[PDB]
Design an enzyme around this catalytic site. Sequence first.
Site, PDB file in Angstrom:
ATOM      1  N   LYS A 147       0.983  -1.315  -0.192  1.00 23.50           N
ATOM      2  CA  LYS A 147      -0.099   0.121  -0.041  1.00 23.50           C
ATOM      3  C   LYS A 147       1.060   1.198  -0.167  1.00 23.50           C
ATOM      4  O   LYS A 147       0.511   2.075  -0.723  1.00 23.50           O
ATOM      5  CB  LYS A 147      -1.068  -0.072   1.108  1.00 23.50           C
ATOM      6  CG  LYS A 147      -1.437  -1.284   1.582  1.00 23.50           C
ATOM      7  CD  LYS A 147      -1.765  -1.376   2.905  1.00 23.50           C
ATOM      8  CE  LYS A 147      -0.657  -1.302   3.868  1.00 23.50           C
ATOM      9  NZ  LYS A 147      -0.343  -2.731   4.540  1.00 23.50           N
ATOM     10  N   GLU A 187       3.166   3.722  11.214  1.00 21.36           N
ATOM     11  CA  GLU A 187       4.194   3.051  10.105  1.00 21.36           C
ATOM     12  C   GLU A 187       5.706   3.048  10.799  1.00 21.36           C
ATOM     13  O   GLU A 187       5.917   3.075  11.840  1.00 21.36           O
ATOM     14  CB  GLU A 187       4.226   3.466   8.641  1.00 21.36           C
ATOM     15  CG  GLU A 187       2.945   3.063   7.718  1.00 21.36           C
ATOM     16  CD  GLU A 187       2.846   1.611   7.760  1.00 21.36           C
ATOM     17  OE1 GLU A 187       3.615   1.038   6.779  1.00 21.36           O
ATOM     18  OE2 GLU A 187       2.212   0.403   8.286  1.00 21.36           O
ATOM     19  N   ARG A 188       6.389   2.519   9.753  1.00 25.79           N
ATOM     20  CA  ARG A 188       8.077   2.422  10.283  1.00 25.79           C
ATOM     21  C   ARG A 188       8.557   3.904  10.087  1.00 25.79           C
ATOM     22  O   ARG A 188       8.516   4.519   9.374  1.00 25.79           O
ATOM     23  CB  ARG A 188       8.527   1.684   9.236  1.00 25.79           C
ATOM     24  CG  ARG A 188       7.860   0.326   8.954  1.00 25.79           C
ATOM     25  CD  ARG A 188       8.683  -0.231   7.664  1.00 25.79           C
ATOM     26  NE  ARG A 188       8.126  -1.647   7.689  1.00 25.79           N
ATOM     27  CZ  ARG A 188       6.712  -1.837   7.171  1.00 25.79           C
ATOM     28  NH1 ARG A 188       5.955  -0.882   6.795  1.00 25.79           N
ATOM     29  NH2 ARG A 188       6.347  -3.146   7.026  1.00 25.79           N
TER      30      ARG A 188
HETATM   31  N1  LIG Z   1       4.057  -1.805  -7.321  1.00 22.59           N
HETATM   32  C1  LIG Z   1       4.977  -2.754  -6.812  1.00 22.59           C
HETATM   33  N2  LIG Z   1       6.152  -3.121  -7.387  1.00 22.59           N
HETATM   34  C2  LIG Z   1       7.229  -4.061  -6.951  1.00 22.59           C
HETATM   35  N3  LIG Z   1       7.126  -4.435  -5.820  1.00 22.59           N
HETATM   36  C3  LIG Z   1       5.787  -4.021  -5.006  1.00 22.59           C
HETATM   37  C4  LIG Z   1       4.946  -3.206  -5.449  1.00 22.59           C
HETATM   38  N4  LIG Z   1       3.973  -3.050  -4.471  1.00 22.59           N
HETATM   39  C5  LIG Z   1       4.437  -3.640  -3.403  1.00 22.59           C
HETATM   40  N5  LIG Z   1       5.724  -4.696  -3.766  1.00 22.59           N
HETATM   41  C6  LIG Z   1       6.561  -5.358  -2.901  1.00 22.59           C
HETATM   42  O1  LIG Z   1       5.791  -5.759  -1.745  1.00 22.59           O
HETATM   43  C7  LIG Z   1       6.470  -5.182  -0.640  1.00 22.59           C
HETATM   44  C8  LIG Z   1       5.672  -4.482   0.355  1.00 22.59           C
HETATM   45  O2  LIG Z   1       5.104  -3.422  -0.322  1.00 22.59           O
HETATM   46  P1  LIG Z   1       4.849  -2.180   0.812  1.00 22.59           P
HETATM   47  O3  LIG Z   1       4.772  -0.746  -0.338  1.00 22.59           O
HETATM   48  O4  LIG Z   1       5.934  -2.048   1.898  1.00 22.59           O
HETATM   49  O5  LIG Z   1       3.407  -2.721   1.023  1.00 22.59           O
HETATM   50  P2  LIG Z   1       2.577  -2.453   2.389  1.00 22.59           P
HETATM   51  O6  LIG Z   1       1.281  -3.108   1.866  1.00 22.59           O
HETATM   52  O7  LIG Z   1       2.388  -0.858   2.579  1.00 22.59           O
HETATM   53  N6  LIG Z   1       3.292  -3.273   3.642  1.00 22.59           N
HETATM   54  P3  LIG Z   1       2.781  -2.864   5.384  1.00 22.59           P
HETATM   55  O8  LIG Z   1       3.062  -1.414   5.106  1.00 22.59           O
HETATM   56  O9  LIG Z   1       4.175  -3.388   6.189  1.00 22.59           O
HETATM   57  O10 LIG Z   1       1.652  -3.694   5.944  1.00 22.59           O
HETATM   58  C9  LIG Z   1       7.888  -4.379  -1.127  1.00 22.59           C
HETATM   59  O11 LIG Z   1       8.994  -4.578  -0.554  1.00 22.59           O
HETATM   60  C10 LIG Z   1       7.482  -4.381  -2.666  1.00 22.59           C
HETATM   61  O12 LIG Z   1       9.022  -5.384  -2.977  1.00 22.59           O
END
Ligand SMILES: Nc1ncnc2c1ncn2[C@@H]1O[C@H](COP(=O)(O)OP(=O)(O)NP(=O)(O)O)[C@@H](O)[C@H]1O
Lengths: 161, 469, 50, 93, 87
Positions: free
Chosen positions: B157, B183-184
């Site tokens: 996200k 968040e982090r």
């Molecule tokens: N559009 C994208 N392209 C490539 N990799 C992605 C993409 N979206 C997510 N990822 C992969 O998935 C991982 C998690 O993405 P992240 O934007 O941190 O998602 P998040 O759902 O916001 N995780 P969290 O905030 O801990 O609940 C990353 O390290 C990316 O490698």
Amino acid sequence: PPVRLFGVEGTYATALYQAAAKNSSIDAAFQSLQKVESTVKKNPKLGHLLLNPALSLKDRNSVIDAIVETHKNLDGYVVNLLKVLSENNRLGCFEKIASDFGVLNDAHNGLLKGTVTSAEPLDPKSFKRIEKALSASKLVGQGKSLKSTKIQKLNKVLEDS
Amino acid sequence: TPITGKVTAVIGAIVDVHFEQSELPAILNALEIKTPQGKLVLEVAQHLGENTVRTIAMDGTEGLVRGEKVLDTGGPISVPVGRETLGRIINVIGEPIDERGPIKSKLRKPIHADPPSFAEQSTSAEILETGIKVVDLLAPYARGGKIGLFGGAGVGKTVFIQELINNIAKAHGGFSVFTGVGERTREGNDLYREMKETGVINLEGESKVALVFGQMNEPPGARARVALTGLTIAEYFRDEEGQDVLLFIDNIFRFTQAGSEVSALLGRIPSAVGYQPTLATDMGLLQERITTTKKGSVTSVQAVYVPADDLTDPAPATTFAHLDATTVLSRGISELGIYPAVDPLDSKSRLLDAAVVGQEHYDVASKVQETLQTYKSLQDIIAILGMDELSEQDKLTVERARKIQRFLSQPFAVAEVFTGIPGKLVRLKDTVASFKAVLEGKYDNIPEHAFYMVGGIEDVVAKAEKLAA
Amino acid sequence: VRYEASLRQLEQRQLAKSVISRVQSELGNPKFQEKVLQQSISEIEQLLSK
Amino acid sequence: PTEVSSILEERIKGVSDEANTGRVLAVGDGIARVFGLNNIQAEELVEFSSGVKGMALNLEPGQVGIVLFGSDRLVKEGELVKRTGNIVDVPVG
Amino acid sequence: ILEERIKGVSDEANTGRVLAVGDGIARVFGLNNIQAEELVEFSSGVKGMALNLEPGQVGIVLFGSDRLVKEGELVKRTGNIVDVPVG
Ligand SMILES: Nc1ncnc2c1ncn2[C@@H]1O[C@H](COP(=O)(O)OP(=O)(O)NP(=O)(O)O)[C@@H](O)[C@H]1O
């Protein structure tokens, strides 16, 4: 008596009022209850020794009996109040039992409530209508520093329109 | 003169304060306890009766001692508003934490304020092109609308939002308010690096954005609040300085999770799944404030976390009804290596209407969805019997849907350190044509792989020639 | 019509705010007539209900 | 039409002329516990001194339990609460 | 002042005493200067921790078997918040 006063915590003072209302024994109970609270709150001595969850059944009864023999007004039915709270673990709330005793005397032999500012007069005549009218006129002129209700109502009506 | 209370009780993030006489601090007011550190803030949650209030701490309650003197500050938590806060990093308690001195604003506003009234409402249906195929095409975002990203852990996200900041925020001109809730701190430290580099934040120059951070290390009071601070700041830029504000929250889930963290200690009987019984209205007060009004537009993207990957959990279930475009991330889809890992079938927007996007974009959409929905219906037969048992018309749809599916994936510039391929931005007119052609089978003769992780339709013909060598 | 209505409403709101400020200032200028009228109103009300 | 502000001030002149209950025990989370209001109906409307309205839902022995129609920042312990004498109701037609 | 020496029940208790102990918790009486998350030692050297502080008692979490505590026991402060050797 019709005063309610809760029904579990407030029944401590109401229970002994029934036995103290015989042979004219309500007058001496007012001045004796005040001596128990005063010698425990502003004494730092028997408070910390009794509020803890240690001691014993016999130890709590002996401490109450020794204090009561040298204090003012404790030789009638006053000794029995402290004994009941010692065995049932209720010595921690001694201020609640003494407060609820005074409200009985002031309700069946006086008025209560309030009016405005500070307190009202609290007369002991009869009916509340003939008392409040004759006391309001005498307390409005004498004193009354006035330091608003009418101003607040007028402003609210003009902002809603 | 000063109004001082006494600390009667400490349980976790909750402090109980007794006040000597009559005038009890109002509910929502800030209290202060002087520490050897600086000071501890407290928020009057409720009157317990008998001159005692119960507060929520805005920080840790370690070291508090019963009997402690507590100062009433006679107002809600205050935050510096207006142009003075641009390029400053801020607290939950509206303080400078960017090691760069006092935020010398003119006004300090309460974080608590009533949501814009009904007469003050203001709607419109203007598209906001994003350059993201899945969105552009399927669930178009709206200028001054409420966008939300749903997804469980590590679906993306945060990276998705960074792609939106990437495109929109650069060529936007007006003011941004980024809010890190739960968040982090790494991520927040990264975002402060990221801005000083694109020049959105210019320490020596002017600045287009503002930073507010109540991160995941914070106590639940801090995190139950920090978003209201962000909001107050945005609300100024909207109502006072009549501006177009871009407002990114990440993650808004972390506000409701904090609400539950404290709720039992606040004495409440819990509710389904062990949430505070007030979860809906506590969200309604906050969500209903993030809005466009007759005095200023606000577009907002919010990151929604989804506990245990369950969409029906009562936190996200209740969110949805607050958004204008909803775009969901599937774990499964990311495990296919499809990014953005959007759910082409679960994502929605009020703006996908012919009256707004026009009959063709409207129809290229529906037909794409029918295709995908059919593929989905067959997932079972193909799982057991495989392809050979499908009919002829069915068989085609699948090969086509699997192409449409791969084509919905797009390289992101921000996510470059994960693909390797430099990221692409397709346009709205670009996307629709591209998909229409595929749905007219004008590319059937191309290996499915070509459609994977490339830009527009031109990039498909490129990669297919590359591989056919 | 929207501009005429907005002007009339702004004028009424400005006049109400100026009237409110004058009423508050007069009460703070020790009014002898307000104190005497407050005692006479309380006595008249209690005699009509008894 | 010809000084419209003067017609609203003359009609809202004399209104407050006949306005001479419980105290609040604790207040939190849309709820106010209240000592008093002895004649109150189950499901009756009450005005708080502060302005905000509420509804009585738990007439218990010691006290009354009130849900508020508003925010509660504005309600404090001890603040006077007032009987309406009406059950919640609406305009129709 | 006359009822101080007339009692005779050792009116010099400065520490706290266990009121009840069970399920890994012990509710101690007193410890008025205690601070939240501060460590505490019990009559048998078992370390606890001050969880919540209410009027009247302190909830204390045991870093050990409940057996090592008894209702009535004397409890001492550490003045230390839960802490470790480092370096
Ligand atoms: N559009 C994208 N392209 C490539 N990799 C992605 C993409 N979206 C997510 N990822 C992969 O998935 C991982 C998690 O993405 P992240 O934007 O941190 O998602 P998040 O759902 O916001 N995780 P969290 O905030 O801990 O609940 C990353 O390290 C990316 O490698």
